Amino acid sequence: GXGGNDNXG
Amino acid sequence: GXGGNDNXG
Amino acid sequence: GXGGNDNXG
Amino acid sequence: GXGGNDNXG
Amino acid sequence: GXGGNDNXG
Amino acid sequence: GXGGNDNXG
């Protein structure tokens, strides 16, 4: 959820 | 959700 | 949702 | 490399 | 390498 | 190498 979850794939 | 979730793929 | 979720793909 | 089938809340 | 089928809350 | 089927809360 608060924050950021990043993965390019 | 608050924040940002970024992945190019 | 509040925030921004960006991925080019 | 560039953008697959993707759709986000 | 670039973007598979992906979709996020 | 680049992005499989992926989707996140």
Next chain:
Amino acid sequence: GXGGNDNXG
């Protein structure tokens, strides 16, 4: 957003 409701109410 995925059947969400993002609100402070």
Next chain:
Amino acid sequence: GXGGNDNXG
């Protein structure tokens, strides 16, 4: 968002 509700209420 995945049937979420992100709120301070």
Next chain:
Amino acid sequence: GXGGNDNXG
């Protein structure tokens, strides 16, 4: 988000 509710309420 996975049927979550992220809130301070």
Next chain:
Amino acid sequence: GXGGNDNXG
């Protein structure tokens, strides 16, 4: 919500 002091920065 009780005292409102619930904000990201």
Next chain:
Amino acid sequence: GXGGNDNXG
């Protein structure tokens, strides 16, 4: 909502 002080910046 009780005291309103619920804003991102």
Next chain:
Amino acid sequence: GXGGNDNXG
């Protein structure tokens, strides 16, 4: 919520 002092930075 009781005392509101619940914020990321």
Next chain:
Amino acid sequence: GXGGNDNXG
């Protein structure tokens, strides 16, 4: 961005 403050150069 909440608390807009970004300038490039």
Next chain:
Amino acid sequence: GXGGNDNXG
């Protein structure tokens, strides 16, 4: 970004 403060150069 909550507490916007990013500038590149």
Next chain:
Amino acid sequence: GXGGNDNXG
């Protein structure tokens, strides 16, 4: 990022 403070160069 809560407490925005990132600048590159």
Next chain:
Amino acid sequence: GXGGNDNXG
């Protein structure tokens, strides 16, 4: 800057 620094936000 020889141009660059382009971002969503």
Next chain:
Amino acid sequence: GXGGNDNXG
């Protein structure tokens, strides 16, 4: 900067 530093945020 020979250009660079491009980010979501």
Next chain:
Amino acid sequence: GXGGNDNXG
């Protein structure tokens, strides 16, 4: 910087 430093955040 010969360009670089690109990040989500």
Next chain:
Amino acid sequence: GXGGNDNXG
């Protein structure tokens, strides 16, 4: 500077 660089040398 983001685009699918699909170019035979």
Next chain:
Amino acid sequence: GXGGNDNXG
């Protein structure tokens, strides 16, 4: 500088 660099030398 993010894109699928699909290029035969």
Next chain:
Amino acid sequence: GXGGNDNXG
């Protein structure tokens, strides 16, 4: 500088 570098030397 992130992309699928699929390139025969």
Next chain:
Amino acid sequence: GXGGNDNXG
């Protein structure tokens, strides 16, 4: 053989 001088992001 495309025997150009291809030199861009």
Next chain:
Amino acid sequence: GXGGNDNXG
């Protein structure tokens, strides 16, 4: 054989 000088992110 694409016998170019391919030199970009």
Next chain:
Amino acid sequence: GXGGNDNXG
């Protein structure tokens, strides 16, 4: 044989 000079992230 793609007998180029391939030299980018």
Next chain:
Amino acid sequence: GXGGNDNXG
């Protein structure tokens, strides 16, 4: 440019 001098000088 936080005291910009990008310049072949």
Next chain:
Amino acid sequence: GXGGNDNXG
């Protein structure tokens, strides 16, 4: 660049 064919990408 001190030749030709450059790209501040």
Next chain:
Amino acid sequence: GXGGNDNXG
């Protein structure tokens, strides 16, 4: 550029 001098000088 936090006292920018990017310059073939």
Next chain:
Amino acid sequence: GXGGNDNXG
């Protein structure tokens, strides 16, 4: 670069 064909990628 002190030749030709460069890319601040």
Next chain:
Amino acid sequence: GXGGNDNXG
């Protein structure tokens, strides 16, 4: 660039 001197000088 926290006292930037990136420069063939």
Next chain:
Amino acid sequence: GXGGNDNXG
């Protein structure tokens, strides 16, 4: 680089 064909990737 003191030749040609470089990429600050």
Next chain:
Amino acid sequence: GXGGNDNXG
């Protein structure tokens, strides 16, 4: 082609 990508890419 149930999500067709037949492509030297």
Next chain:
Amino acid sequence: GXGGNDNXG
């Protein structure tokens, strides 16, 4: 092709 990627990539 039940998520087709037949591709020299």
Next chain:
Amino acid sequence: GXGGNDNXG
């Protein structure tokens, strides 16, 4: 192809 990736990759 029940998640097809047949590919010299």
Next chain:
Amino acid sequence: GXGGNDNXG
């Protein structure tokens, strides 16, 4: 084919 339903790709 009774109950026509065949599609190739």
Next chain:
Amino acid sequence: GXGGNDNXG
């Protein structure tokens, strides 16, 4: 085929 349902890829 009774109950036509065949699709190749």
Next chain:
Amino acid sequence: GXGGNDNXG
């Protein structure tokens, strides 16, 4: 085939 359900890939 009665209960047509065959798909190759």
Next chain:
Amino acid sequence: GXGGNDNXG
């Protein structure tokens, strides 16, 4: 599909 899948039915 590089062509194929030819059938009576």
Next chain:
Amino acid sequence: GXGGNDNXG
């Protein structure tokens, strides 16, 4: 599919 899957039915 590099072509194949050919059938009576």
Next chain:
Amino acid sequence: GXGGNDNXG
């Protein structure tokens, strides 16, 4: 699939 899977049915 490098082609194959051919059947009567």
Next chain:
Amino acid sequence: GXGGNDNXG
């Protein structure tokens, strides 16, 4: 023929 319900799919 008695009740007519006699059909391939």
Next chain:
Amino acid sequence: GXGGNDNXG
């Protein structure tokens, strides 16, 4: 034929 319910799929 008696009750008609006599069909391949």
Next chain:
Amino acid sequence: GXGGNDNXG
């Protein structure tokens, strides 16, 4: 035929 419920799939 008596009750009709006589079908392959």
Next chain:
Amino acid sequence: GXGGNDNXG
């Protein structure tokens, strides 16, 4: 069919 009669009658 070989002096056959294939019928539900």
Next chain:
Amino acid sequence: GXGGNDNXG
């Protein structure tokens, strides 16, 4: 068909 009669009559 071989002196056949294929009928539901």
Next chain:
Amino acid sequence: GXGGNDNXG
């Protein structure tokens, strides 16, 4: 079929 009669009648 071999002087057969294949029927539900």
Next chain:
Amino acid sequence: GXGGNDNXG
């Protein structure tokens, strides 16, 4: 007879 009987020879 209902159906299809295929043989190239």
Next chain:
Amino acid sequence: GXGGNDNXG
């Protein structure tokens, strides 16, 4: 007879 009998020879 209902169905299909295939043999190339």
Next chain:
Amino acid sequence: GXGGNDNXG
């Protein structure tokens, strides 16, 4: 007869 009998010879 219902079904399929296949032999290439």
Next chain:
Amino acid sequence: GXGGNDNXG
């Protein structure tokens, strides 16, 4: 290999 004297009901 291809097709002899053949004839079918």
Next chain:
Amino acid sequence: GXGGNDNXG
């Protein structure tokens, strides 16, 4: 190898 004298109900 391919097809002898053959004929089918």
Next chain:
Amino acid sequence: GXGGNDNXG
């Protein structure tokens, strides 16, 4: 190896 005198109900 391929197909003798053959004929089927």
Next chain:
Amino acid sequence: GXGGNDNXG
């Protein structure tokens, strides 16, 4: 792709 491939190497 079915035909009598009668071809001396």
Next chain:
Amino acid sequence: GXGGNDNXG
């Protein structure tokens, strides 16, 4: 891909 491959190496 079915045919009589009658071909002297």
Next chain:
Amino acid sequence: GXGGNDNXG
């Protein structure tokens, strides 16, 4: 891929 492979090495 079925055919009489009658081929002298």
Next chain:
Amino acid sequence: GXGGNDNXG
């Protein structure tokens, strides 16, 4: 194929 003379047969 990364040569010449190919056939998706």
Next chain:
Amino acid sequence: GXGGNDNXG
């Protein structure tokens, strides 16, 4: 194939 003379048969 990474040569020549291939057949997805």
Next chain:
Amino acid sequence: GXGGNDNXG
């Protein structure tokens, strides 16, 4: 001797 490059179904 037919000294060709014969490479098709």
Next chain:
Amino acid sequence: GXGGNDNXG
């Protein structure tokens, strides 16, 4: 195949 003369038979 990493040579020549291959057949996905």
Next chain:
Amino acid sequence: GXGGNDNXG
């Protein structure tokens, strides 16, 4: 001697 490169189903 047919001294070809025979390489198909």
Next chain:
Amino acid sequence: GXGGNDNXG
């Protein structure tokens, strides 16, 4: 002697 490179089903 047929001194070919015979390499297919």
